[PDB]
Amino acid sequence: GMKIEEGKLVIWINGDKGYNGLAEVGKKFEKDTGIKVTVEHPDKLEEKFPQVAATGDGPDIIFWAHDRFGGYAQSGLLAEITPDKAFQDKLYPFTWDAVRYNGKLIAYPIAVEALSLIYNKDLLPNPPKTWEEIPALDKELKAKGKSALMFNLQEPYFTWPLIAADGGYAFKDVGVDNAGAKAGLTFLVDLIKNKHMNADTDYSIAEAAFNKGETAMTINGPWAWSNIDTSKVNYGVTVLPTFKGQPSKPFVGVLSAGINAASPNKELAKEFLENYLLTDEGLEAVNKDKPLGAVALKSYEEELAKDPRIAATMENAQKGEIMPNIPQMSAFWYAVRTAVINAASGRQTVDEALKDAQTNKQWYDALTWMRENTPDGEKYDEYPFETYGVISWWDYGHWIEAVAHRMPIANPFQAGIGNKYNNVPGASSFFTAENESYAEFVAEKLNVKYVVSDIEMETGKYYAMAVWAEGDLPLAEKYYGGYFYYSPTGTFGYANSQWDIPLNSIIIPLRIPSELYYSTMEAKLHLFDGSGLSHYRMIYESDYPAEWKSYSSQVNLNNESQVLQTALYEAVMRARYGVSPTMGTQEVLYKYAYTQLYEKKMGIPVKIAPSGYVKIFERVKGAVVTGKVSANVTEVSVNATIKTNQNRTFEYWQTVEVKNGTYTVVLPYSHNSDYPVKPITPYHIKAGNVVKEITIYESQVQNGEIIQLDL
């Protein structure tokens, strides 16, 4: 006979939830009513729902974290639910707040999720009730080869519960730079300054430290429990510590069930949810498949609560903050993530970090509003003639694009900046290129023939290039190491971390680059003068930075000892006022640091000496020299002395692997170019005890011609 259209309830839930258990509840409903219930778990259902809600594929009921439902309700996709007072009284009242758009309920709460304090009972049978207790506890444990506490410091989801504690921050606003946030962030950074925690501690490091028994406590959620069980750590889960007497405030996620505005069976959906799912029997079926954690239903929660871990989840959740809807949470996350990381790393003071977090949040909130309140929403989200422009100062264009999803008139991205994370050729991806092959990819795409670098690009501005290349402030931190200092006993030293520096030291306020920096194109070009590169040659350099032009009148710039002595002298002189060295001195210290820390591994020679403020290089095919290797060796080296137009000399080196009896080296300098920077020695090509000297014509370099030369 005829087909049927209102005969079924279609339910969508994510694949990581107990859908088989939910289907058992569906089977009971079907047995009782004859209405068949189909539980589906489509991939990306939370993205598909707004598209298909009104179609034949649309589900009658959708299960998801409450923080998507605001958006759904905003588009009119969810029916107002109508539970009576008796039914509302069956759930914890705070859970209903997660699904109320005021007055109106738009979903049924099912379960709640929040962070707890997790502790090792064998190291710490009585966990601390306050954050204030943690440093003394760490002192005790450090004596025994352990630490008190390790958790993910990289993500505001994990750090905000402490930062929000004082004043009990709630989302709309006070806002994020309020005095309570300053107190909490200050306490957090103090734990780092005093070595109770480490600023680079992330999720994986904290989880490994805890599950291998190295730290007494961690902060994490129910998703982390499985790995702990596997580790056989004797662990407990409990209420988060208070700060200044006030509860830590973790974000709360409430898994919720909304009813499709377009469903022709809203009353049956209500019946399924209220009288089948939200019962002890119903929640148990789902929970037995995959654990719901703490549930919104009081009667069942009181059964689950005999697992102390679940009791702890609910207690922290009742003390926490319902997570704001995704777009608000995102604006908050963007702003605060950088603040904590900058404060924790010493890039900024707590005050200035939270100050910028707040102003950044103003911008992110404004752009989020623009995204939801100006036309052509869905055409911009897939990110032509019928577009419009948003005009603002050029400093803001990338935010306008990334946050508002609108087209800025003044746009950083398309000013030839490019990036590394998406492989878009541009200045940032060229200068931070981690090998020449990558640099050549970028250069060829852009038809680069000349490179101009100054000492600012080498030093202070490199940071900006890395931020753009990585598309993120924190990600740029991997380009940097620690600090030079003089101890109170006069001993010169290097520390990976400022906090490892002895008290009363004189610290040179110049962050030294990490190994990664020295391998990038900007370093290869400006710091190493192009040494090692096959496709670039220097053709001109300007005069020295003025301070070094001046020093040269009383120091020999070719004596590394005198140069270093002079550099350290200036650095200390300025360091007493907390001022960084002059640019040329920064370069000298970068070179010195390389020779002390990284040269043994990387093997490129560099003289500790200053150099031209501005350097021009030409990009060339390079002359190819290749031949058989008769000597019993695995490498071939080529070197030449280059002299610039300032009469400074440096060494060009390149070393290649012998590949089955042959070598191939690509050389960018010629010996008859009309440029004022030129090699003043032939190339010296060495394979063991075999040494051969060669000079190259400019036509060979320009046309990439091949030279046969056996060794």
Author numbering: -1 to 170, 180 to 366, 500 to 523, 541 to 868
What did the authors write?
Oligosaccharyltransferase (OST) catalyzes the transfer of an oligosaccharide chain from a lipid-linked oligosaccharide (LLO) donor to the asparagine residues in the N-glycosylation sequon, Asn-X-Ser/Thr (X ≠ Pro). The catalytic subunit of the OST enzyme is the only subunit conserved evolutionally across the three domains of life, and it is referred to as STT3 (Staurosporine and Temperature sensitivity 3) in eukaryotes, AglB (Archaeal Glycosylation B) in archaea, and PglB (Protein Glycosylation B) in eubacteria. The STT3/AglB/PglB proteins share a common overall architecture, consisting of an N-terminal multi-spanning transmembrane region and a C-terminal globular domain. The genome of the hyperthermophilic archaeon, Archaeoglobus fulgidus, encodes three AglB paralogous genes.
In the present study, we determined the crystal structure of the C-terminal globular domain of AfAglB-L, as a fusion with maltose binding protein, at 1.90 Å resolutions. We connected MBP to the C-terminal globular domain of AfAglB-L, without a flexible linker sequence between them. In fact, MBP-sAglB crystallized only in the apo form in the absence of maltose, and the crystals diffracted to high resolution. In the final model, residues 171 to 180 in MBP were missing, as well as residues 524 to 540 in AfAglB-L. Interestingly, the C-terminal α-helix of MBP and the N-terminal α-helix of AfAglB-L were fused to form a long, continuous α-helical structure, which fixed the relative orientations of MBP and AfAglB-L in the crystal. We found that the two molecules of MBP-sAglB exhibited an intertwined structure, related by a 2-fold rotational axis in the crystal. We found that the Asn568-Pro-Phe-Gln-Ala-Gly573 segment in the AfAglB-L portion was the hinge loop region. Thus, the formation of the intertwined dimer is a crystallographic artifact and lacks biological significance. The overall structure of the C-terminal domain of AfAglB-L consists of three structural units, called CC (central core), IS (insertion), and P1 (peripheral 1). The additional sequence forms three α-helices (αA, αB, and αC), which is unique among the six structures. By reference to the present AfAglB-L structure, we concluded that the kinked helix of AfAglB-L contained a four-residue insertion between the first and second signature residues, Glu613 and Lys618, respectively, of the variant type of DK motif.
